[PDB]
Each structure stands twice: as C-alpha cells, then as structure tokens.
Amino acid sequence: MVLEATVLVIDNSEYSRNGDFPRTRFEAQIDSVEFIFQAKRNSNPENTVGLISGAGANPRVLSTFTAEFGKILAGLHDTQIEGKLHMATALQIAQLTLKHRQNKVQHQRIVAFVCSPISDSRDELIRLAKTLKKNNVAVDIINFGEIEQNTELLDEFIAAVNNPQEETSHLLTVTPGPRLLYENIASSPIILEEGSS
Amino acid sequence: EIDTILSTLRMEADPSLHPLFEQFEKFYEEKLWFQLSESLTKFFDDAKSTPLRLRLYDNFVSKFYDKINQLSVVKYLLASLKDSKDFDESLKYLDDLKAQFQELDSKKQRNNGSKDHGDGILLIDSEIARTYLLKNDLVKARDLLDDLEKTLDKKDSIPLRITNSFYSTNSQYFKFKNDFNSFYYTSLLYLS
Amino acid sequence: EQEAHNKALNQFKRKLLEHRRYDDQLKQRRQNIRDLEKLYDKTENDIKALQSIGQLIGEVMKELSEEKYIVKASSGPRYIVGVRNSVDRSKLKKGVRVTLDITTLTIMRILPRETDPLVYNMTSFEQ
Amino acid sequence: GDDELDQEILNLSTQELQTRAKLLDNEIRIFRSELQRLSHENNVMLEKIKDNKEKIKNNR
Amino acid sequence: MSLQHEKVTIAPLVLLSALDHYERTQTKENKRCVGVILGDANSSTIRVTNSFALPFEEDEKNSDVWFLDHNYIENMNEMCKKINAKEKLIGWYHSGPKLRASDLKINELFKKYTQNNPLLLIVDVKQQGVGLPTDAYVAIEQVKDDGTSTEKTFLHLPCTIEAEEAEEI
Structure with a gap:
C-alpha cells in the first residue's frame, strides 16, 4: 500500500536453479524485483525498498533502504546462490532494517519469496510471528517453496500476525506450473491490498 | 532422447540400484534438479566400480552444466576415472570436459552473475596431475602441482574441496618418491 | 509468403532483430565501464598523492650519538634530527641522501644519490 | 532477423516460430536487467569522477 | 588479503573515540x-x-x-x-x-571491503588490562592439525602504540 517501506527477502538456494519457473527461478526473480519497485513507486514515490538475502549461512543486508532502483539491482549482481535461506533469523534481521526508514511515516512491510521447504521449527517461528505485529510489522509470504510437498507452518504464522492494524499479513501461493512467476506476482494485489484497523 | 539410454542402463543395473535409476528419470522430467543432485550421489556410492557409473554420467553432463551444481558435477568425474584402470582413457575424458567448462564460463558466468564455474576447472586439473603419477611421471605432475599451489594462495576464500584435491595430488607424488615423512604431513593437512 | 500466419511472423522477425541489436547495447556499455574504471582511478591516484606532503632532502653530515644525526639540508643550514626505525643505523653513512620530515625533521628513509639537473642534459649529448 | 520468417517454415514447424519469439521474451527480459544494471553503474561512476576532480581543480 | 601479520600498532585517538x-x-x-x-x-x-x-x-x-x-x-x-x-x-x-562468537560472522561482512584480513580491536569502556585497555585479534582461516576441521578463528597478536609527536604532547 501507499506510504510503505518494504524489505524484500530473496531466498537464495539451489532450489532456485530449478527450471520449473523460467528459466531458472532466480532469473525469474530478477525480472520480478524490477516490476515490484515500479509498482510501489508509481503508487507513491516516497516509498523506499530495502533488500536482504538468505545467501550465506546467515542472512545479510545487500541494500538498506534506498530510493535508488539501481542499488537494489546492484545488490542482486553481488548476491551468491549457494547460500540457504534461514527464515527465523531473516525475520529478525529485517525487523532491524525496518526501524531505519527515509521517513517514519513509511509503514513496515516484509515481502518474502520462498523457494525451499523451510525446516525451522513451527513453535520457534510462532514467537517471531507475534513479535512482528508488536513492532507493527506485517509479512506477505509469496509461497512457492513449501508446495513442493511440504506442510503449511505458514497458515499459523499469517493468522498470528493479523490483528487490527493497517498493516495486514497475506498468504499468497503462486502456481508452480509455467505461467511466469513474475507475471502472477505482479498481477496479484500488492497495491490493491487492504488494512484491518 | 535420454529417456531411452536411462532405461537400458536400469535393466543392466543391479536390482538394488534399480530404484535409484528410476529417480533420475523423474527428477529430470520434473525440473527439480536439486533433488536430481541428491539421487546421483546416493547411486554413485554403491556403484563406484560398477561400469554403469561412467555411462550414466556422460548423459547428464552433456545436457546440464550449471542447472545441476558445478562442484557436484566434477566431484563425480574424478572418482570415476580413479577406478578406471586405463590411464590413457582417464586423461582424454578429463581434458575434454575441462575444455567445455572454460568455454561455458564466458556466457553463464556473467549473465547469472551469481555462480562461478571457474572453480570446477581447478578441481579437474588436480586429477590430470594424478593421471601422470598413475603413469608414474613425477615431473609433469609437479609442474601442475606448483600451479595449483599458487592458485590456492591467490583465492582469499578457499573451498574445502579444492585444498583436498590439491593435497591428494601431493600425497600420491610423495609415495612414488617413497618418502615417508613428506607423505605424512600432506595427509595430515588433507584429513583435517 | 506461404501463409497468412506469416503476416504475424514478420512481427517475430522484428523482435529477434531488436534483441540482437540489444546485444550490441550490452556490448556498447560493457566497453564504457572498463574504460571509466581506469579513468576514475587515474584521478583517484591523484588524490592519494595530493594528500601526501613533501619531504626535505639532506645528507648525513656526521653522527652525533646513535638516535640523533647531524644532517646538512639541501635548503642549506645543518640541523640535528632523529630517525624512524625503518632506517637502519649502519645504512646511515656520511654522504648518503636522506629524507627528513618537513614538520618533524626526522629521517623516514634513505634516498638514492642526488644528481645535477645539468648532467642529465650531458648524457643527452652524444648527438 | 535471419529467422522466424518463411525461411524457417521449412526448417521447423510454424508453431515452433510462434513459441520461439516468446522464449526470446524471457531472454530480453534478462538482457534488460543487465543493461539497466549497467545504467546505474555508469551514473554512479561519472559522479565519482566529479568528486575527485573538484578537489583537483582547486589545487590546480 | 594479507595473510602475513605480526603486530598491531594503535594510535591513542582510536581508543578514546570509540x-x-x-x-x-x-x-x-x-x-x-x-x-x-x-x-x-x-x-x-x-x-x-x-x-x-x-x-x-x-x-x-x-x-x-x-x-x-x-x-x-x-x-x-x-x-x-x-x-x-x-x-x-x-x-x-x-x-x-x-x-563473542557472533564476532566471527560479523567479520565476514568487512572482508568484502578490505585488502587485509579484518581486525577486531576490542576497545574496553571499563578500561581493564594491566597494559593497554585494548585487546587485538585478526581473523585467520587455517587447517588445524589436531584432527579437527578448518576453523576461522581470532588469533591474538601483540598490541603496541604509534602516536604522532604532535598528538603525544
């Protein structure tokens, strides 16, 4: 939505060398990011985007909040795919990035791509899910990792985050079959989303 | 295309290596090629010296070079020709495959910009030196050993894999020399 | 033509050629960044020299003690100076050119022999 | 465009040509990422020479 | 990266500023x-x-x-x-x-910008030590010959000071 700062979490994996999506998942994600930046920027150009990865054995900030479209892009040129996303720590590292903003009017939002089944514990992540909304952070989970035969720990995470709050958590699952990952995500409500106050 | 070749190898293969064969066909079709990496590793452990190993590997390397991990792909190749008792066969096959990856990294390395493929070339070179030692030539292996050694120092992050292969070359060289201690120090570094 | 679906393959012939001429915009810009990397460095090199300061040449006239030396500067007047540890005492002999600092007056390093500007015209005479 | 015309009706099917341009759409979406990647670096580089030369003209 | 080190000299300013x-x-x-x-x-x-x-x-x-x-x-x-x-x-x-053992993971990030293995200088704010209130490490990655895997570890080097004469007075 408008007046919004977004940390996009890109899942870095060997699961995204898979050619299910086009013509790996990673090369599909390059296109996707560019699209997302313009969507938000043309809704309101006081929005900013930060980017972290899972790459490494620990998450890392590739870009702090910047109004620069090219800095986000440069970040993807730097990132490495042999790393594995660990979601528990990535949420916590995003929360700190979301304290720093261009203006404090910018709302707090996480967008997370999932390309691997997550093997962090459910009860562990349910603490974190409820930490988010105290900080006023909601999380949109684009899911295409936990649908390669895996349970939805996610169902619980999204309900725990939702509350009266104009930041509203969303669960999106994206058709894994060829229709172009980026097309579906761009076409999916992301600037037509609603609050919950 | 490759479905046919796989099917002949399965029938030829053991009834215990048969269900592993099935898995290759499925993952290739499905484009889930990280799981394809998993099924190949399982197979090759109790197929090391069975002759299906090398034939299977020729099929998959020809198709995919980087949509299935580069480091995995080479690490299969080196073991296959260690078990190969024809050193003249070993030398050309490494030499041919080394050529492919060097050609590859002009295009893939910059576009993908997040996977390097030059690291594989180094792993291959270790075995070429070792084919000389299998042929009992110490000097040729040594000139490649010197190149490997400087190159390790040059990278300022080193995969475990590369420093292992580099020591493995050294260790085999020293016991053709019959020197005990030199072997010992090399193997200590390598085992760790 | 052979088809009237080849009225829509003209449209596809156009996309290919655009992409193959977009290949040439990949190759145009890949040549401008490698030239500008050296041009940003040629001026980066200028900053690191500019922020350095000069040094004043002398020669070791006479040992006084062992951590203090009499030099006769090339500005003229003799001074008493100390030394950096980088210069060794036994490479400090008399008639050896030294740097001094120009705000601390301390030897940092031994310098090659000084030589006249004039005698560099003289080796350029053999014509 | 030495392809995707009536030359290539002979070589492969007309439906191969329908889809082929649509695999070149993925391919230029990638070359566009890289070309715009290189737009941002030439914008930053030129301004990094401006930062250098500004001191240099003062000393000059 | 320089894999050769011996000592760390520290200016007085550094400690006070942190x-x-x-x-x-x-x-x-x-x-x-x-x-x-x-x-x-x-x-x-x-x-x-x-x-x-x-x-x-x-x-x-x-x-x-x-x-x-x-x-x-x-x-x-x-x-x-x-x-x-x-x-x-x-x-x-x-x-x-x-x-801290989280300091090894932090050290990773500064490798990207250094032509030398990155330094950890612990500036105490309780000013402990019977010499300088600074400890010094540099991260080195090495094989360990004790039968244990390759570590990146912080190995100690001596601490010394180099002070400008102007500052020292």
Missing part, C-alpha cells in the same frame, strides 16, 4: 557499539589511525542477528579521503569486555 561514540549511541547490556576501523595495512604491523561509528543495532536476544547499514560505509569512506586519502577499512572495533 569510548565517545559508545556513550552517544547510549550502548550497554549486550548492545555494543560497533564501528569501522580505519588505517594503513598490507603491512605486518596493522597501523590504526582512526575509527568512526556506523549505524549499528545489536539484538541482545540473539547476537547472531545484527543490523549493519552497508550503504553508509561507502559514503563515509569518500569523506575519509577528504580528510586524508590514505585511510581505508582494515577491520572493525568491538566495544564489549570480550570476544
């Missing part, structure tokens, strides 16, 4: 000020001339979770040249009483 920056982030109780370390290297003697704060957040729940603002580090370095064009990253300081 204590100042520490109280002005208002850090205490496992929130520890971490800034960049500036100076000369490609030298066995690491010569640290200056230090500055970075915007940094340390979570006390997990210290493996941390915030580092990477973008800021490039901008600051351009202003370091304005002061003197012979100051670069040669590590990062820690303000805490002692070495």
Whole structure:
C-alpha cells in the first residue's frame, strides 16, 4: 500500500536453479524485483525498498533502504546462490532494517519469496510471528517453496500476525506450473491490498 | 532422447540400484534438479566400480552444466576415472570436459552473475596431475602441482574441496618418491 | 509468403532483430565501464598523492650519538634530527641522501644519490 | 532477423516460430536487467569522477 | 588479503573515540557499539589511525542477528579521503569486555571491503588490562592439525602504540 517501506527477502538456494519457473527461478526473480519497485513507486514515490538475502549461512543486508532502483539491482549482481535461506533469523534481521526508514511515516512491510521447504521449527517461528505485529510489522509470504510437498507452518504464522492494524499479513501461493512467476506476482494485489484497523 | 539410454542402463543395473535409476528419470522430467543432485550421489556410492557409473554420467553432463551444481558435477568425474584402470582413457575424458567448462564460463558466468564455474576447472586439473603419477611421471605432475599451489594462495576464500584435491595430488607424488615423512604431513593437512 | 500466419511472423522477425541489436547495447556499455574504471582511478591516484606532503632532502653530515644525526639540508643550514626505525643505523653513512620530515625533521628513509639537473642534459649529448 | 520468417517454415514447424519469439521474451527480459544494471553503474561512476576532480581543480 | 601479520600498532585517538561514540549511541547490556576501523595495512604491523561509528543495532536476544547499514560505509569512506586519502577499512572495533562468537560472522561482512584480513580491536569502556585497555585479534582461516576441521578463528597478536609527536604532547 501507499506510504510503505518494504524489505524484500530473496531466498537464495539451489532450489532456485530449478527450471520449473523460467528459466531458472532466480532469473525469474530478477525480472520480478524490477516490476515490484515500479509498482510501489508509481503508487507513491516516497516509498523506499530495502533488500536482504538468505545467501550465506546467515542472512545479510545487500541494500538498506534506498530510493535508488539501481542499488537494489546492484545488490542482486553481488548476491551468491549457494547460500540457504534461514527464515527465523531473516525475520529478525529485517525487523532491524525496518526501524531505519527515509521517513517514519513509511509503514513496515516484509515481502518474502520462498523457494525451499523451510525446516525451522513451527513453535520457534510462532514467537517471531507475534513479535512482528508488536513492532507493527506485517509479512506477505509469496509461497512457492513449501508446495513442493511440504506442510503449511505458514497458515499459523499469517493468522498470528493479523490483528487490527493497517498493516495486514497475506498468504499468497503462486502456481508452480509455467505461467511466469513474475507475471502472477505482479498481477496479484500488492497495491490493491487492504488494512484491518 | 535420454529417456531411452536411462532405461537400458536400469535393466543392466543391479536390482538394488534399480530404484535409484528410476529417480533420475523423474527428477529430470520434473525440473527439480536439486533433488536430481541428491539421487546421483546416493547411486554413485554403491556403484563406484560398477561400469554403469561412467555411462550414466556422460548423459547428464552433456545436457546440464550449471542447472545441476558445478562442484557436484566434477566431484563425480574424478572418482570415476580413479577406478578406471586405463590411464590413457582417464586423461582424454578429463581434458575434454575441462575444455567445455572454460568455454561455458564466458556466457553463464556473467549473465547469472551469481555462480562461478571457474572453480570446477581447478578441481579437474588436480586429477590430470594424478593421471601422470598413475603413469608414474613425477615431473609433469609437479609442474601442475606448483600451479595449483599458487592458485590456492591467490583465492582469499578457499573451498574445502579444492585444498583436498590439491593435497591428494601431493600425497600420491610423495609415495612414488617413497618418502615417508613428506607423505605424512600432506595427509595430515588433507584429513583435517 | 506461404501463409497468412506469416503476416504475424514478420512481427517475430522484428523482435529477434531488436534483441540482437540489444546485444550490441550490452556490448556498447560493457566497453564504457572498463574504460571509466581506469579513468576514475587515474584521478583517484591523484588524490592519494595530493594528500601526501613533501619531504626535505639532506645528507648525513656526521653522527652525533646513535638516535640523533647531524644532517646538512639541501635548503642549506645543518640541523640535528632523529630517525624512524625503518632506517637502519649502519645504512646511515656520511654522504648518503636522506629524507627528513618537513614538520618533524626526522629521517623516514634513505634516498638514492642526488644528481645535477645539468648532467642529465650531458648524457643527452652524444648527438 | 535471419529467422522466424518463411525461411524457417521449412526448417521447423510454424508453431515452433510462434513459441520461439516468446522464449526470446524471457531472454530480453534478462538482457534488460543487465543493461539497466549497467545504467546505474555508469551514473554512479561519472559522479565519482566529479568528486575527485573538484578537489583537483582547486589545487590546480 | 594479507595473510602475513605480526603486530598491531594503535594510535591513542582510536581508543578514546570509540569510548565517545559508545556513550552517544547510549550502548550497554549486550548492545555494543560497533564501528569501522580505519588505517594503513598490507603491512605486518596493522597501523590504526582512526575509527568512526556506523549505524549499528545489536539484538541482545540473539547476537547472531545484527543490523549493519552497508550503504553508509561507502559514503563515509569518500569523506575519509577528504580528510586524508590514505585511510581505508582494515577491520572493525568491538566495544564489549570480550570476544563473542557472533564476532566471527560479523567479520565476514568487512572482508568484502578490505585488502587485509579484518581486525577486531576490542576497545574496553571499563578500561581493564594491566597494559593497554585494548585487546587485538585478526581473523585467520587455517587447517588445524589436531584432527579437527578448518576453523576461522581470532588469533591474538601483540598490541603496541604509534602516536604522532604532535598528538603525544
């Protein structure tokens, strides 16, 4: 939505060398990011985007909040795919990035791509899910990792985050079959989303 | 295309290596090629010296070079020709495959910009030196050993894999020399 | 033509050629960044020299003690100076050119022999 | 465009040509990422020479 | 990266400045000020001339979770040249009483910008030690011959000072 700062979490994996999506998942994600930046920027150009990865054995900030479209892009040129996303720590590292903003009017939002089944514990992540909304952070989970035969720990995470709050958590699952990952995500409500106050 | 070749190898293969064969066909079709990496590793452990190993590997390397991990792909190749008792066969096959990856990294390395493929070339070179030692030539292996050694120092992050292969070359060289201690120090570094 | 679906393959012939001429915009810009990397460095090199300061040449006239030396500067007047540890005492002999600092007056390093500007015209005479 | 015309009706099917341009759409979406990647670096580089030369003209 | 080291020389300014920056982030109780370390290297003697704060957040729940603002580090370095064009990253300081095992993962991030293995200089703010109130490590990766795997570990080097005469008086 408008007046919004977004940390996009890109899942870095060997699961995204898979050619299910086009013509790996990673090369599909390059296109996707560019699209997302313009969507938000043309809704309101006081929005900013930060980017972290899972790459490494620990998450890392590739870009702090910047109004620069090219800095986000440069970040993807730097990132490495042999790393594995660990979601528990990535949420916590995003929360700190979301304290720093261009203006404090910018709302707090996480967008997370999932390309691997997550093997962090459910009860562990349910603490974190409820930490988010105290900080006023909601999380949109684009899911295409936990649908390669895996349970939805996610169902619980999204309900725990939702509350009266104009930041509203969303669960999106994206058709894994060829229709172009980026097309579906761009076409999916992301600037037509609603609050919950 | 490759479905046919796989099917002949399965029938030829053991009834215990048969269900592993099935898995290759499925993952290739499905484009889930990280799981394809998993099924190949399982197979090759109790197929090391069975002759299906090398034939299977020729099929998959020809198709995919980087949509299935580069480091995995080479690490299969080196073991296959260690078990190969024809050193003249070993030398050309490494030499041919080394050529492919060097050609590859002009295009893939910059576009993908997040996977390097030059690291594989180094792993291959270790075995070429070792084919000389299998042929009992110490000097040729040594000139490649010197190149490997400087190159390790040059990278300022080193995969475990590369420093292992580099020591493995050294260790085999020293016991053709019959020197005990030199072997010992090399193997200590390598085992760790 | 052979088809009237080849009225829509003209449209596809156009996309290919655009992409193959977009290949040439990949190759145009890949040549401008490698030239500008050296041009940003040629001026980066200028900053690191500019922020350095000069040094004043002398020669070791006479040992006084062992951590203090009499030099006769090339500005003229003799001074008493100390030394950096980088210069060794036994490479400090008399008639050896030294740097001094120009705000601390301390030897940092031994310098090659000084030589006249004039005698560099003289080796350029053999014509 | 030495392809995707009536030359290539002979070589492969007309439906191969329908889809082929649509695999070149993925391919230029990638070359566009890289070309715009290189737009941002030439914008930053030129301004990094401006930062250098500004001191240099003062000393000059 | 230089894999050759011997000593760390420290200017007096560095220590005092990290204590100042520490109280002005208002850090205490496992929130520890971490800034960049500036100076000369490609030298066995690491010569640290200056230090500055970075915007940094340390979570006390997990210290493996941390915030580092990477973008800021490039901008600051351009202003370091304005002061003197012979100051670069040669590590990062820690303000805490002692070495953490989350400090190894932090050290990774500064490798990207250093031509030398990155320095950990613990500037104490309780001023302990019977010599200088600084401990010094540099991260080295090595095989260990004890039958244990390859570690990256912080190995101790001596601490010394090099002070400008102007400053010393």
